Amino acid sequence: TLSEAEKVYIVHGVQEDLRVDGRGCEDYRCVEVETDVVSNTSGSARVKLGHTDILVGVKAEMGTPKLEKPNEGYLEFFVDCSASATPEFEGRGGDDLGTEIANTLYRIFNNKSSVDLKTLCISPREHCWVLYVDVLLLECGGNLFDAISIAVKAALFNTRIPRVRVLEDEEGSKDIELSDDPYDCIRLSVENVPCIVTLCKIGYRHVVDATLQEEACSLASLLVSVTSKGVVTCMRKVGKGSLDPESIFEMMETGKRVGKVLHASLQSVVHKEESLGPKRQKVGFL
Amino acid sequence: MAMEMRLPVARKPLSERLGRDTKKHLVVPGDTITTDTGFMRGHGTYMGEEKLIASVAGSVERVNKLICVKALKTRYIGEVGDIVVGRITEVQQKRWKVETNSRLDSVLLLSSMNLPGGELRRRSAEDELAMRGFLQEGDLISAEVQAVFSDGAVSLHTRSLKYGKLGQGVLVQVSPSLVKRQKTHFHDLPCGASVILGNNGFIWIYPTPEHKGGFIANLEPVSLADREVISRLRNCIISLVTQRMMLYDTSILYCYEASLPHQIKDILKPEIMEEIVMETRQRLLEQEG
Amino acid sequence: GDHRRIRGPEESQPPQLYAADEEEAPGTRDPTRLRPVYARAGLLSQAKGSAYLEAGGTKVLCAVSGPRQAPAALRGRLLCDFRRAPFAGRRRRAPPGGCEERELALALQEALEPAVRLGRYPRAQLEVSALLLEDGGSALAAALTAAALALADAGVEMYDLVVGCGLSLAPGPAPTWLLDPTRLEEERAAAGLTVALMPVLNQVAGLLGSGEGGLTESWAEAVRLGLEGCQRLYPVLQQSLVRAARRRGAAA
Amino acid sequence: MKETPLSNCERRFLLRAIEEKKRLDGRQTYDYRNIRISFGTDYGCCIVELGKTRVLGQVSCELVSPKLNRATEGILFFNLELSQMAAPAFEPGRQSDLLVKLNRLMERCLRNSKCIDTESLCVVAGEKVWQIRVDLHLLNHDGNIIDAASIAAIVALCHFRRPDVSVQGDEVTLYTPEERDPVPLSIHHMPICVSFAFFQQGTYLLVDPNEREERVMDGLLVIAMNKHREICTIQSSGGIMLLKDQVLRCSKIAGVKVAEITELILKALENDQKVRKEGGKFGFAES
Amino acid sequence: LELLSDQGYRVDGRRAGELRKIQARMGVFAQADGSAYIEQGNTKALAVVYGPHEIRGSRARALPDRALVNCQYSSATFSTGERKRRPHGDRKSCEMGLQLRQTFEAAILTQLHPRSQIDIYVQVLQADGGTYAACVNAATLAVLDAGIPMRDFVCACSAGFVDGTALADLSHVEEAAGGPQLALALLPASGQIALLEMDARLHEDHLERVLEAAAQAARDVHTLLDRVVRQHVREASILLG
Amino acid sequence: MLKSKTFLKKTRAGGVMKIVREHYLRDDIGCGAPGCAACGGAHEGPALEPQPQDPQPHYLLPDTNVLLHQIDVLEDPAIRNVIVLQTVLQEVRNRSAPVYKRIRDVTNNQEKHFYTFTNEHHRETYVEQEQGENANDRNNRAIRVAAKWYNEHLKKMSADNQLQVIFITNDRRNKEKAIEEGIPAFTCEEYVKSLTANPELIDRLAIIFSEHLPLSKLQQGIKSGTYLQGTFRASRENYLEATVWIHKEIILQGLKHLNRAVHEDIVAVELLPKSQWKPTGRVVGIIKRNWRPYCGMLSKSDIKESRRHLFTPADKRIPRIRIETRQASTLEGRRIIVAIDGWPRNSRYPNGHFVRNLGDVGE
Ligand SMILES: [Zn+2]
């Protein structure tokens, strides 16, 4: 929380196109991305956006497919809103935000065109892959959703599912054949996995990467989910306040542009890192 | 626009760029301070089996006969004249409850807060009800300590009109062990602004006025030429603290003068941060001696 | 095993999934059409305010347990419990839920907090309780409208009413925005959307969406279309409230 | 409700009587209280009361689909409940710390020590196996639980009998206690915990502490043992600084104590069998 | 697979009396009052200590004599290869909470911060054996970073017993074998144990061995930790002036 | 140093996951020879000898196949000294339990210098895995690196007029590759011939089952035609001669035709052409399994870590069983009883489970 006069200061700053960090209204801050942090997972990633630190694990397990969709697998999301973020979270107080974020992440992936699940099917109705994604919060410094999305995408990109041949046999005997080639593990495309974008409205001007001090100063925030092409998967609205019908359009256009830029930068970075190799040493928490 | 991503680079520890080899006496818990005939203990130690044993990580300080420790990170312990900046948290029937970087909830008694102008007669129930409409929950006060209770809490007051409630400005929260204990925390810099440096870790940054006690809110705009300076000062303070160096007039003034070439935003990128801090540190060190 | 409900079977799957048929597709219709609406306020007695809304197969109740003791800190609150009856929808779900009920509850809260003015209800929490008896299409919008009616009925202050509207996308080659659809047009759909606004001052209050796909311009057209639908729907609710107030005048 | 506070008078008197090595009721420090083991009518019920602390133990069985990691051996399900009759403070869902520590400790002690044969109780490897649950209930709370809970679980799991079963291929046939004679379990060794209580940071140690002694103690050392001198678990709680020789000595004590308790338990089961072999639905043993 | 080759070596390639290289750090998260990180092999614990601050919702539990320690445990879902859910609220994380709490209430020297919460939090990102000790040690480093007074490094580690010998700082493999594993946490300066957990069957005469072995392993861990802490303090002071 | 090696695994719950283990590369490992200072002089226990003489000095180290097929060429006392590796020993352990046991029982003898060398945990001989190279190739290349390292080490140690190492193969492919890698290398035959010692050295050397058709097809074929059901039975005579009684008497032999029947079952025999007959039948399915708890004893695998243990029932008309119990310490010597649970298409033994113990034999 904070006072009223500080809110006046911040809103007139935005209206003037400056901010306490001396940046405009369409400028993120240096986001430190890393991948392959944890080892026991089939994929992992970490993000440090200003003062918000997110970790993401991805485990590719084997499970029964879903009766309505046996021809392909599924993603599940869990979100540990560890009290390490702000002590006001505990075994019960973080469930709210965790549930909210998980429901969003689902809503981003009832798209059928983001992760080609057909590539995750072994034997329809009999066996399939399951991507258990596990988000882990460690700080809360705003622009939470965008960082979580970027981490999800970096983790997917860094996911390595092994090849398995599940061979049937009579008298109910099933066999799994591995490929002893950890270098020959498959990779799922992310050319459509979308990034979130949180446009918070302050005064009569909209802003991106709404720091806390500015979230408290706002009244509405439009979440958009964009892909590198320019489409808009999801369009949600969050805030205890109102929102005009016209500003929606500006917010959406800005989300489109910012998504283009963001996806370009992320793709370049992660190709770079994949190029380097074990020479990077995987500096994490050290 | 402009967005940038970058991998994390590994730190460069040991601060070898300085090369000091300090002449101090560091310790850690379990360490045994000098055991001698009747040495008095201070904050940062305890006794066991006729042996003075440290309790906290830092450097030991031996005043004439008193042995104390000076940790490197703590929460503001209450002194008796230290100024302070505070964000209010509650409004009890009798007083206000304020949050400093302290181990408890600081207290401002209704008897302490100055009145509009100099209308001083006494405190009644009408004041008890204006207790809210004037000092809203969440506001900020720039006070000085009045006394410290045996339970640890700090009762603070407002000696004059230079203190009281604060305007709009901006704020930063740093560690309290990164502000040199000196006088005149209230500075008014030539840059075009003014700053308040709490004996706690709360720094306040407000544009300096022209008239020269918070009983009115001047919720007017602020010239761009006086908000850019404030933002630059804010980022410069964040730089200083991120490099673990002390904080006071000359330090911030010189980081300012250093961060003119580098624009108002590109001086949080750790490289720029580090080079500015090094320039400032070197010039302080060489000029002072 | 839950020890606060009757011992039933461990698992139980419905028969439909064991069916063998290509379900019937709607076909064609007037995209800018609206279903017949029955809205009445004042149904329930033991509640300070209640409302009931029926639009097609949609059947929703909402009740308002009024102020119950519990500036910017002495500002009111309203906690909303959305809940779909276990006998709605092709499939059965245990009463508790915990996945989508809470999402739609957040939606209701985010769409109601704006309209309601809570400075005049300090130190108080309004318990809004919605109930969805039957799902037949646009559900969250009906729930928003019903909660608005129930509040306006109990006599809590406001700035304007809340009108919702649900849209879907036809997955055909020429995708058109389908207004106020049915559970069939919504399960055989590519994208879905929900607007909710305050028509006097023309301000959105809470919206939501999702898509197998889409694009900026399409979403914008959807938005304006939902706005027009809500405008065309508002008068019904007006008349309903007037009618309930007349009945009150009659009772005494 | 709430527990009545403890007066400084009682506290100081207790600390002094400890300094002087004097208990209250009149026993030494290396002594339990008269423990009684009483049986019920149904195979698997036991009420064990040490002094004033009574605890009930029931053992039940079921057949269920096992868990994939272990499709050969069965299952076992502990649970201890602190009935509000044990003491006022034991409201439901409030004294959860004590429940958690006791249940984890007991699970560990019995399960991981491999006291019973989870393999013997297999019927169809992959489809149907046994499932033995044991519900302990705390009736009166005067002092030492873990010892009572354990003695009860053990007397039960040694005084329980399954409905016999016949099998051929997949054809499984269950039967009633009247058609055949139920079959007992398979135990390898009976562990029973032993509770030590530390006073004055570690200077003094007591056995089988009463409730007050538990209120004026700083630390608790639980030690599980058998008649064959095999540590199964040991745990320190209360935030206390002990040493090595203390645990060594406590172990050399637990040895003798467990030997004696075990002798008693065996005598009790013998007497119960004798009774039922003569007409009578009870069995009683006294320390 | 095997645990002790006839020569004396283990699987990982280390004798019984030694352990794996802990690699740590102090100062991860700045938005807190104290933070740490540790990897005692593949394990990766992460601690946080929100300092002695005010109690809200007083609910009549603010001890007037001493301080109020509230330590929370958590084992991430992706920690083990087998995914699990409900890392908090379980009947095991709460036991770990009790354990950590009764250790640090012993060490943290609360008599100086009465009516105040010391909130300790622990999250385990990766588990490969020795999952409690890594957390104890990370929370210790955290406490220290938060300038909270405390009697001594409360250093913890685990030991085990195989083929008539004692192993130090077990991993998951020999932890899954079912053999006796004894975890503990002691205060080196005095030689006093703050915690002693243990779970499996073994004879009594084979107790002193594993006990002293775990103790010596904890001493070694003490050496490593204190070297880290001294580097940290030295660097900080140098930067001050 | 430190190395993180990953590898995948199939669970017991029909699943796959990943492991990431650590591997410590210690540099304080010993060669086994006293002369090599800078490796440790005072190094007791099993170790080599200063002057060997059967290229007179001639230390030597074999490969897996040699251990697997000529252990007697080594168990013999006519030899004195030899090096043993870690990968070799691990493979021996994985394939044959008795051979591994023998090699260990010999390494325990201070005289026959079977000094072991932990190559995996050494900073120099260790070699990582490479894409496109199976585990067998990994171990082979590791052994070659160890040999080359041994030659260099023992080369710089002294004037080399005192000791020289040898590599031994079984097939000439591996030997020839070794030569092309720049080291000595022999096959066991060449060596055991060159010594012209007593001839004792050469003297000491010189199923997948069919499918099963479901009950539907069996019952359909009996009524419709060919197949016919009957009671299976075996004989104390032979493990292969079996008799089916139809509900007439068929005979059938061979472990295939004995497609997983037991003393008393209900098989669905098919009849073989008259070119083999008195008739000869075959099995393709079971109509009713009819089992019971068989009494017997637990023949264990000497590996004290192994869970799977073999069971010998008393009635000779039953096959041994492959059970999973972990005890294997309290049971050996005490008659138990086991219940059968299956016979998949991969095991010459079925899969059972313990149900109760009775008492030591003889009582
Ligand atoms: Zn050597």
Q: What residue ranges do the domains of chain C occupy?
A: 1-252
CB contact under 8 A, F131 and A170: no
Rounded to whole angstroms, the Cα distance separating E5 from E8 reads 6
DSSP alpha helix (H) spans, C92-135: 101-112
Q: Please, are residues B199 and B82 in contact by the beta-carbon 8 Å criterion?
A: yes
Question: In this complex, how many residue pairs, one in chain A and one in chain E, have their CB atoms less than 8 Å apart?
Answer: 77
Q: Is the dihedral of CA D142, D144, D145, D148 positive or negative?
A: negative
Is C72 an 8 Å CB contact of chain B?
Answer: yes
Protein residues within 5 Å, CB atom, of ion ligand 1: F 31, 36, 39
Return d(Cα A237, Cα A74) in angstroms, integer.
Answer: 26
CB contact under 8 A, C71 and B138: no
Helix residue ranges per DSSP H, B97-248: 125-133, 224-242
Checking DSSP bridges between strand A164-167 and strand A195-202, what pairing results, if any?
A: unpaired
CATH number assigned to the domain with residue range A1-286, chosen from the 4 options 2.60.120.260, 3.30.420.40, 3.30.230.70, 3.40.50.300: 3.30.230.70
Backbone angles phi, psi at B93, to 5 degrees: -50, -30
* A165 Rama class: left (phi>0) / alpha (psi -120 to 50) / beta: beta
C-alpha F197/C-alpha D163 separation (Å) is 71
Token pair of D105 as six digits: 């400790």
Contact yes or no for C130/C60 (Cβ under 8 A): yes
**Ligand 1 center–CA F147 separation, angstroms:** 13
Indicate the residue type of F321. Answer: I
Phi, psi of F91 (to 5 degrees): -65, -50
Read off the DSSP letter of residue E204: S
| Per-residue CA distances from D195 to B112, D148, D257, D286 (Å) | 57, 10, 11, 20
**For the domain with range E17-241, which CATH number is right: 3.30.230.70, 3.40.50.2000, 3.40.91.10, 3.40.50.170?**
3.30.230.70
Cross-chain residue pair E13–F20, CB shorter than 8 Å? no
Query: What CATH class has D1-287?
Result: alpha beta
CB contact B63 to A (< 8 Å): no
For chain B, the farthest-separated pair of C-alpha atoms sits apart, in whole angstroms, at 69
Are F99 and F68 in contact, with CB atoms under 8 Å apart?
Answer: yes
- Any idea which residue has 């113990």 for tokens? F357
Report the interhelical angle of D244-276 vs E207-240 (nearest 10°).
140
Domain boundaries of chain E, sorted by first residue? 17-241
Q: Are C150 and C41 in contact (CB under 8 A)?
A: yes
**Contact flag C211-A67 (C-beta cutoff 8 Å):** no
Which residue ranges make up each domain of chain B? Answer: 19-76, 77-211+213-289
Resolution attained, angstroms: 3.5
| E interface test, pick of F10, F11, F16, F22 with most E CB neighbours within 10 Å | F22
Contact F335/F322 with Cβ under 8 angstroms? no
Question: Phi, psi at residue C31, to the nearest 5°?
Answer: -55, -40
The CATH T-level fold of domain B19-76 is: OB fold (Dihydrolipoamide Acetyltransferase, E2P) (2.40.50)
Cα separation, A60 vs B151, whole angstroms: 55
- Helices and strands (H, E) in chain A, number of each type: 5, 14
Q: What is the C-alpha R_g of chain F?
A: 27
Contact of E37 with chain B, judged by CB distance below 8 Å, is answered with no
Rounded to whole angstroms, how far apart are CA atoms D129 and D245? 45
Q: Do F354 and D119 touch (CB under 8 A)?
A: yes
Per-window interface: E 88-117 vs B, CB < 8 A: 109, 113-116
Task: Name the minimum distance, in Å, from the CA of F147 to any CA of chain A.
Answer: 27
Contact F23 E1 (CB under 8 A): no
Please, which residues bridge with residue F342 across strands?
F351
- Chain D residues at the F interface, defined by Cβ less than 8 Å, are 68-72, 119-120, 122, 124-126, 167-170, 186, 188
Alpha-carbon gap: A284 to the closest alpha carbon of chain E (Å): 10
CA distance D218 to E194: 12
* Type of residue numbered F26: R
If we measure between CA atoms, which residue out of D247, D226, D250 comes closest to residue D30? D250
Q: What are the residues facing B54 on neighbouring strands? A: B45
CATH of domain C1-252: 3.30.230.70
Is E93 within 8 Å of E73 (Cβ atoms)?
A: yes
> Mutating which of E3, E5, E18, E169 best tests the F interface, going by the most F Cβ atoms within 10 A?
E5
Q: Which residues of B touch E146 (CB under 8 A)?
A: 73
d(CA A262, CA A256): 10
> What b/e string do you get for D108-129 counting C-beta neighbours within 10 Å, with b at 16 or more?
bbbeebbbbbbbbbbbbbeebb
Q: Report chain A residues touching chain F, CB-CB < 8 A.
A: 39-42, 61-62, 162, 164, 169-171, 173-174, 176, 178, 180-184
Q: How far apart are CA D123 and CA D133, in angstroms?
A: 17
Chain E environment of F20 (Cβ under 8 Å): 42, 128
CATH number at residue F75: 3.40.50.1010
Distance in Å, CA F23 to ligand 1 centroid: 21
Domain ranges, ordered by start, for chain A: 1-286
Residue B276 CA to residue B256 CA, distance in Å, equals: 9
Whole-angstrom distance, CA of residue E11 vs CA of residue F232: 49
Q: Do B9 and A18 touch (CB under 8 A)?
A: no
CB contact under 8 A, B71 and E241: no
Residue E234 corresponds to which amino acid? R
Q: What stretch of H or E contains E222?
A: helix E207-240
Question: Checking phi first, is residue F183 left (phi over 0); if not, alpha (psi -120 to 50) or beta?
Answer: beta
Query: What number of C-beta contacts closer than 8 Å exist between E and F?
Result: 41
The string of DSSP letters for F249-261 reads: EEEE-STTTS-S-
Find which of D67, D116, D241 to mutate to test the E interface (most E CBs within 10 Å of its CB).
D241
Please report how many Cα atoms fall inside a 13 Å half-sphere around the Cα of residue D95, on the Cβ side. 19
Neighbours of chain D (3+ CB pairs under 8 A): E, F
Structural domain containing residue F38: 2-204
φ/ψ of B88, rounded to 5, equals -75, 150
> Within 13 Å and on the Cβ side, how many CA atoms surround A129?
26
Gapped junctions in chain E, after residues (C–N > 2.5 Å): none
Helix, strand, or coil (residue B8):
coil
User: Which among A3, A29, A268 is the nearest to B140, CB-wise?
Assistant: A3
- Backbone phi and psi for residue A210, each to the nearest 5 degrees, phi listed first: -75, 95
Q: What are phi and psi of D279, to 5 degrees?
A: 95, 105
Cα(C129)–Cα(C62) distance, integer angstroms: 6
Give the whole-angstrom CA distance, residue C107 versus residue C99. Answer: 13
Q: Let me know: does D133 contact D76? Beta carbons within 8 Å.
A: yes
How many Å lie between the centroid of ligand 1 and the Cα of residue B285?
Answer: 56
Alpha-carbon distance E164 to nearest alpha carbon in chain F (angstroms): 14
DSSP F254-306: STTTS-S--SSEEEEEEEPPTT----BEEEEEEEE-----EEEEEEPPS-TT-
- Residue numbers in E near D244 (CB within 8 A): 208, 211-212, 215
Interface of A with C (CB under 8 A): 67-68, 99-100, 103, 107, 110-113, 230-245, 248-249, 252-253, 256
Q: Cβ of D100 and E95 within 8 Å?
A: yes
Q: Between the CA of residue C67 and those of C75, C126, C155, what are the distances in Å? A: 12, 5, 11
- Structure token digits, residue D8: 């400084």
Residue D161 identity (one-letter amino acid): R
**Residue D139, SS3 per DSSP:** coil
Can you tell me the distance from the alpha carbon of E78 to that of E125, in angstroms, rounded to the nearest whole number? 7
